[PDB]
């Protein structure tokens, strides 16, 4: 019961019993919280509650210190001091923002704005509170029981009455019953277990709610600038391949942390792996939120770094298949590749945290808590997609509010910027450069003359809330007959149900905009599907069209983004 105030660090015995996490609040801060919010339960060794038998007064504003015990107005002795008076709550060792974080429901974008504009201490209070709120919300959903098993990838489910049914996408990972994690995709539905199992009727699925651990480290350590490269030893013999990044590699060694904004195909993996070749004796931990982001760093490392000094850290509670070429779970190898949630407690000369738009402040803090490093490098792009905020339903979350790193990149600018896109045909580069890069992204490739746009609203149908546009798929089908080279295209849309329909009608491999991030394909066929805030999001639009190396066909619903596409328009 003795700790430090979450706002001003002043030692105290008081914790807010009404807050979901129970933060310690000093006398002068606890008061300003109880007096401005519905939160009135104050806890010390024992709660501030009326000691009189059978009395239910818990509100600290209605309580007094009667000698050594606590009583309300109705039970206090003659000589009794109010627990609440003179700007303080009585405690040992004798905030408008803390109040909003403590009481919000995390459904508004303004909640996330505050969680990123508040003091560092409140960014951790905000991140822990949010995550606990998200986990308790999983309990709201109804249990899914197997009614019948059709095939090895198809079943029919029975849902709990009186409780809502969770969305059926890859975002929502169930737990079978303890037959391993399972996912669903759309009366026939597609089942997919992280463990292969002969689906038994009666077996049920629940979204696994995980215990939210406390946060201790800041999202960003305090910045330090150095006059020389510190604790790192550069090479003179540096491969011409990486010569373009030498000045930025030196910048990395002359600051405690650095931010790198890398638009699509500008050389983020190449930069990250080249940092290892520039400081050859440095121990580097390569981290990211997703297994796909960590695997892409492994792939680039396989090509340039000694395979014997690499290790892929895999949590024994294996969910999806990941990179199999390095020695597994060797925490002490010079190069360690690991997701944030699986990071061991270790030190490093450099920590490289990739795909930073996908990180939350909870992730930023966990990295600073598990890894003690001489230098930290944050790689990503605030113009790409952030992590899904399952509770957020009102308002759009801007890039400067994704996390502390993205906030810094959008306000003071990134420390380093990769300005040349080597992946995309110039039509795509020119469009996204104007759309989200303030005209600073330059094209390496020429215009491919294989980038097309078609304005076709079609017809929007819905599978629950996930959207389908069958006429936009029909327009694609007609295009494919006339453009057989496009047979090899990856179909992309902002909706899984649209992708399910295009998979059966077109036979192309399918990908949501969100799951395509980090990947590249020679040809992309994109159907916007709808003109909603989701399908019109500039970050999602940016990711969707920058997946293409050679050609792209965009069937658009929104006149605005259609007009912005610097593509050859098609007719039908
Ligand atoms: C119990 S909590 O309020 O939910 N989380 C505390 C986060 C924190 C930890 C250390 C600090 F120096 C500042 C804040
Ligand atoms: Zn409270
Ligand atoms: Zn305080
Ligand atoms: Zn009483």
Curated annotation (Swiss-Prot):
A ribonucleoside 5'-triphosphate binds at residues 262-269. Residues 419-572 form the (+)RNA virus helicase C-terminal domain. LRR repeats lie at residues 208-228. Changing residue 409 to I: In strain: Kappa/B.1.617.1. It is found in: Host endoplasmic reticulum-Golgi intermediate compartment. Zn(2+) 13 binds at residues 50, 55, 72, 75. Interacts with nsp8 to form the replication-transcription complex (RTC): nsp12, nsp7, two subunits of nsp8, and up to two subunits of nsp13. Interacts with host TBK1; this interaction inhibits TBK1 phosphorylation and decreases by 75% IRF3 phosphorylation, which leads to reduced IFN-beta production. This is Helicase nsp13. It comes from Severe acute respiratory syndrome coronavirus 2 (2019-nCoV). The gene is rep. The chain holds residues 5325 to 5916 of 7096 of the full protein.
């Amino acid at each position: 019961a003795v700790g430090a105030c979450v706002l001003c660090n002043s030692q105290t015995s008081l914790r807010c019993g009404a807050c979901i996490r129970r933060p310690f609040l000093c006398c002068k801060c606890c008061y300003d919280h109880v007096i401005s919010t519905s939160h009135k339960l104050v806890l010390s060794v024992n709660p501030y509650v009326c000691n009189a038998p059978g009395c239910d007064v818990t509100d600290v504003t209605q309580l007094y210190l009667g000698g050594m015990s606590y009583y309300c107005k109705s039970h206090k002795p003659p000589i009794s001091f109010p627990l609440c008076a003179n700007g303080q709550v009585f405690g040992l060792y004798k905030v408008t923002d803390f109040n909003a974080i403590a009481t919000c429901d995390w459904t508004n974008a303004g909640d996330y704005i505050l969680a990123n504009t508040c003091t560092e201490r409140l960014k951790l209070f905000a991140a822990e509170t949010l995550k606990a709120t998200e986990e308790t919300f999983k309990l709201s959903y109804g249990i899914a029981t197997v009614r019948e098993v059709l095939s090895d990838r198809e079943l029919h489910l029975s849902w709990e009455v009186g409780k809502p049914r969770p969305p059926l996408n890859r975002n929502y990972v169930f737990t079978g019953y303890q037959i391993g994690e399972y996912t669903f995709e759309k009366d026939a539905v597609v089942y997919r277990g992280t463990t292969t199992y002969k689906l038994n009727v009666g077996d049920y699925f629940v979204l696994t709610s995980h215990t939210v651990m406390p946060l201790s480290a800041p999202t960003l350590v305090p910045q330090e600038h150095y006059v020389r490269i510190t604790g790192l030893y550069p090479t003179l013999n540096i491969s011409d391949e990486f010569s373009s990044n030498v000045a930025n590699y030196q910048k990395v060694g002359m600051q405690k942390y650095s931010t790198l904004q890398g638009p699509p195909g500008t050389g983020k993996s190449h930069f990250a792996i080249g940092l290892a070749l520039y400081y050859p004796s440095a121990r580097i931990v390569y981290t990211a939120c997703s297994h796909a982001a960590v695997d892409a760093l492994c792939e680039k490392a396989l090509k340039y770094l000694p395979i014997d000094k690499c290790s892929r850290i895999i949590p024994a509670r294996a969910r999806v298949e990941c990179f199999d070429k390095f020695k597994v779970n060797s925490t002490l190898e010079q190069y360690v590749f690991c997701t944030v949630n699986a990071l061991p407690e270790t030190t490093a000369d450099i920590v490289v945290f990739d795909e930073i738009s996908m990180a939350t402040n909870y992730d930023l803090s966990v990295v600073n808590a598990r890894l003690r490093a001489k230098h930290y490098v944050y790689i990503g792009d605030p113009a790409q997609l952030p992590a899904p905020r399952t509770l957020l339903t009102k308002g759009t979350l801007e890039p400067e509010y994704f996390n502390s790193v993205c906030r810094l990149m959008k306000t003071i600018g990134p420390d380093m910027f990769l300005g040349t896109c080597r992946r995309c045909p110039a039509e795509i580069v020119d469009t996204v450069s104007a759309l989200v890069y303030d005209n600073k992204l330059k094209a390496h490739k020429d215009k491919s003359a294989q980038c097309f746009k078609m304005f076709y609203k079609g017809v929007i149908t819905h599978d629950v809330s996930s959207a389908i546009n069958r006429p936009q798929i029909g327009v694609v089908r007609e295009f494919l007959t006339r453009n057989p080279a496009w047979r090899k295209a990856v179909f992309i849309s902002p909706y899984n149900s649209q992708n399910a329909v295009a998979s059966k009608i077109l036979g192309l491999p399918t990908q949501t905009v969100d799951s395509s991030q980090g990947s590249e394909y020679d040809y992309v066929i994109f159907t916007q599907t709808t003109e909603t805030a989701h399908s019109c999001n500039v970050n999602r639009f940016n990711v969707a069209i920058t997946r293409a190396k050679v050609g792209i066909l965009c069937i658009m619903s929104d006149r605005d983004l259609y007009d912005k596409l610097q593509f050859t328009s098609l007719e039908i």
